[PDB]
Design an enzyme around this catalytic site. Sequence first.
Site, PDB file in Angstrom:
ATOM      1  N   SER A 149       0.863  -1.203   0.000  1.00 54.52           N
ATOM      2  CA  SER A 149       0.000   0.000   0.000  1.00 54.52           C
ATOM      3  C   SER A 149       0.891   1.242   0.000  1.00 54.52           C
ATOM      4  O   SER A 149       1.778   1.357  -0.866  1.00 54.52           O
ATOM      5  CB  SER A 149      -0.966  -0.099   1.163  1.00 54.52           C
TER       6      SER A 149
ATOM      7  N   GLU B 288      -8.932  -5.920  -3.478  1.00 59.01           N
ATOM      8  CA  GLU B 288      -8.363  -4.658  -3.021  1.00 59.01           C
ATOM      9  C   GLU B 288      -9.305  -3.739  -2.250  1.00 59.01           C
ATOM     10  O   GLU B 288      -9.136  -3.538  -1.047  1.00 59.01           O
ATOM     11  CB  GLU B 288      -7.802  -3.893  -4.212  1.00 59.01           C
TER      12      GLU B 288
ATOM     13  N   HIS C 286      -7.260  -6.207   0.952  1.00 54.34           N
ATOM     14  CA  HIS C 286      -6.019  -5.481   0.841  1.00 54.34           C
ATOM     15  C   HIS C 286      -5.163  -5.706   2.083  1.00 54.34           C
ATOM     16  O   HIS C 286      -5.618  -5.522   3.217  1.00 54.34           O
ATOM     17  CB  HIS C 286      -6.366  -4.016   0.644  1.00 54.34           C
TER      18      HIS C 286
END
Lengths: 535, 535
Positions: B200, B329, B442
Amino acid sequence: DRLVVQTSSGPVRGRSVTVQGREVHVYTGIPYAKPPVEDLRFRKPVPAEPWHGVLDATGLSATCVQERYEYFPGFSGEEIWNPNTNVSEDCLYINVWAPANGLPILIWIYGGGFMTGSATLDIYNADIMAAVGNVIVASFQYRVGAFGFLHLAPEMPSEFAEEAPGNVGLWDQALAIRWLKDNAHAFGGNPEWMTLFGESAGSSSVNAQLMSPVTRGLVKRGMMQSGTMNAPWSHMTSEKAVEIGKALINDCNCNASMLKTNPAHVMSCMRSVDAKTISVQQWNSYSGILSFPSAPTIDGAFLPADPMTLMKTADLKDYDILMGNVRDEGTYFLLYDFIDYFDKDDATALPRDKYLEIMNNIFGKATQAEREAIIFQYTSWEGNPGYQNQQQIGRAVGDHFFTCPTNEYAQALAERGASVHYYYFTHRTSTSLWGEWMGVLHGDEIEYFFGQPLNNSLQYRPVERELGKRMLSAVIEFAKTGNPAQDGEEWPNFSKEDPVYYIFSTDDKIEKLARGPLAARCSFWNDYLPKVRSW
Amino acid sequence: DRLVVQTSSGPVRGRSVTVQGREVHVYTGIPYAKPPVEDLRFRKPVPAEPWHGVLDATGLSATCVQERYEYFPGFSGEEIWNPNTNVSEDCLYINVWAPANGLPILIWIYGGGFMTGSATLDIYNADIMAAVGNVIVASFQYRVGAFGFLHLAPEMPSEFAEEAPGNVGLWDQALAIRWLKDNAHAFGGNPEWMTLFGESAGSSSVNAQLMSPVTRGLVKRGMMQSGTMNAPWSHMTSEKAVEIGKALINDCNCNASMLKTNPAHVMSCMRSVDAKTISVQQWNSYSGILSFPSAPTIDGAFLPADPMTLMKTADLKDYDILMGNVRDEGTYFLLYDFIDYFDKDDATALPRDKYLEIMNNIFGKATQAEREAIIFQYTSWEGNPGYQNQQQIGRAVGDHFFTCPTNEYAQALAERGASVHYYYFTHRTSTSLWGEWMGVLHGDEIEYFFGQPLNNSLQYRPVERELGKRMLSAVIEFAKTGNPAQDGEEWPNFSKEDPVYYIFSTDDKIEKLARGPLAARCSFWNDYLPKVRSW
Ligand SMILES: *[C@@H]1O[C@H](CO)[C@@H](OC2O[C@H](CO)[C@@H](O[C@H]3O[C@H](CO)[C@@H](O)[C@H](O[C@H]4O[C@H](CO)[C@@H](O)[C@H](O[C@H]5O[C@H](CO)[C@@H](O)[C@H](O)[C@@H]5O)[C@@H]4O)[C@@H]3O)[C@H](O)[C@H]2NC(C)=O)[C@H](O)[C@H]1NC(C)=O
Ligand SMILES: [Cl-]
Ligand SMILES: [Cl-]
């Protein structure tokens, strides 16, 4: 002579045929109007003057004037849509199939984009339908091409209104249908039990005959096969038709410009051009695939408004509509106006060069906005590059031009109160002489709804005969009851709220009733694309 | 003391751990900068003054100042992203894992939207990676939130440039990375054999460290997990950051307006606000899910241009990038900023009320044109009404915010010459304590790339241990060779021309290599939507 019927215009003699246990008396060639020739070219039909002797109604009619496709010489599959009989303006004749308070009447209107078509092609043989369905089937030639649809009254003074009003082909149908109600009883039928049914432009013509203020009430039960008047190929503004008409009437070396200081010398000129030359010259206002020079024309008369505006007020309370589409609608026309790119018989690996090639031409008349939206909606990543790109254009054209307009019309009809049942024809008949990639061509459902699989002298797989059996029966049952559904077989109404459709195929492991797929495909054209057209 | 390393700033003492047959000396808490407190809040980091005694590098560092999510009280799955140690500005410390011309160095940058995250969460435990991969793993806190990214130099005179340049969190990383190259040999590693890897914002930070003119050349081998600087949450104009910064610096009752006639009295004021209040006040410039108040800021320095403009000239000849995404995600964030609509644990039948509800909010900052295009691209007819509508927004956010930006960055990187391998993580770990509908959240790939399935004290299905085994090995092999591929296992480069990606899962009947699906999903965002933005 038991094979003689006295019609409102005279006795007629037909033939006896024994199909599938029933005897059917098939009368072909009954005149229903004066031959629209000389003075009567371009004008509304006048009824036929009555005859005295017993008219020979055994010969097939002459086919209305039209040119014929031969992009595939010899290849039967193309010539089966071409006139099987002599082509002459002398063509306004009726055909009636009568089995040996009256039987139900199914009137067949052939298709062909208001440019082609004949009631006499064997594809349209109603012998099996009459015998098996024990119903009266009738059909009739209507003037097509510039002969049926030339429109010039706006460009002429008022006195010349009846010189070229437009839509006389539809008036022809109106007249033929009016003829059939008059003589219903004389052939053994109930005049109030009438049902129109047709395919493509025939489907659209059924539509017009049902909605037109001219004819409305005459019959409120119709089957429309892949043809609705809201479709772009099936309606046309007056001003467009005048442009097309003005082009043809000097495309035919007839001036076209003095149409309003001294018109029908222009007509007199057009009254004396050989039909064949108009039959070919009309096509030079054709380009933009599936936008023909002749169409139901908004005329203040037969078509008083745009079809969808007409729908806004029409109240179809007592109307039964059986309508639908075949799986690969647009693929017959893709092969035709893009034969440069696609094979008659085998699939084409279409590139992306050639994909935007084709998409951009088809849709040039639309915003770049919706052009790009269409191109993206019919891009296929997961398909075999090429084959799936060819196949995705055949969907795009199938969708925009047929399925989704009739999906839209079907929803509008039910909103106005009509009882609409929707069908989707997805079986590829085992004797399809077309390329396998074109799958379920437009018009492939015709022979099935006519029951031709029942013809044991025609090699169809066994369950294909059960699909004809079923499809023919859905048409009969519809005509008899307004409802194509059978006993213990569900087939509920199609509304915007529940756009369920019956699926005709011979895989017995698909879900017969379906809603999602068609609605998704047509959401693009009928909901989303209108929003993209906001500049 | 064999557990003592003399670092450039002093001797340090770590702990011994024996993981999976190898001994690893794990040194946590080494300072790499002066604690950025008092005067040094908001400023670039200064290196740490050296120490004399053997520093205790056994305690875990303090976690950089940040607030913590508790939308699910007790629910472990949320608190595993929350600081496990004391939160203080005193947080600029390094951690080094060294097994017992030098071993390869993997430097871990944690994620959390430049607003959250700590190198010390057990999710980031590099014990197994060091032992199994026989490599040196390091990590480090960088200042996050307003502490790392407040940007006000444009609004100040020139002399005050170093007062709040912005990006000091990235400078922190730069410093930490510079520290690790200096002390590579002292821990048993090759300083030239370094590899960044993160997830990320960490993934994005790797990106920045690789591309920045400030740091460029320091290391040209990076793994980016769902985080690229072209993504909207991962870069921010200078002028935006000044607006955000000006808001916070009177959100904190510090005037913010005299920033340019007598500034750093505003700073002096901000130098004496308690950290917790900024740690909460920073969030009031947050709304618009996934657009945080702090981001790599275009500053003329660390980020001299927009990331994609920087890419246009960068020549990444000798760069090895291993990047990718997880299947679902955007679903972690959907549950968070729309917890009003979605359950922690079970799926939601989302209506169409609620579908446009949510879509229209997320994307209000875009044209109605592309708003509608997105809404139509993520409409699901064939899915179970509701579940598939919830699921289709999680795709929309997953796609727009992560997968498709990194897909775009991945293509841009390869064009500039980098050797890019792409992966797609689609396995839902059997101990996912999240709702099954959120599938592959995610961050779910983190523990897998760290080899945590290999931890026999953690109940994972057998083939999940083989997925960790494999995913951990792809990271090691990448670090060792620039190529995550194994022997006899194909995993070719990802380019725009062949955007092939490896797929990590534990269904052994999927195609490991795939190109079509991701490219289709991202064609919308990366090709088509830009065209819709033409007014
Ligand atoms: C089932 O599938 C069959 C195979 O496709 C199909 O076949 C055939 O049937 C048609 C019509 O019955 C045949 O068509 C022509 O050939 C006949 C002899 O081979 C001709 O006599 C006839 O021609 C002429 O007849 C027309 C009949 O409507 C008519 O337009 C004209 O004349 C007639 O009538 C007067 C007075 O009665 C007579 O003086 C004339 O001699 C003439 O009969 C026209 O001149 C047929 O048009 C065809 O050959 C058959 N075989 C094949 C292989 O096609 C069936 O029709 C299908 N349908 C059913 C229900 O079984
Ligand atoms: Cl019987
Ligand atoms: Cl070993």
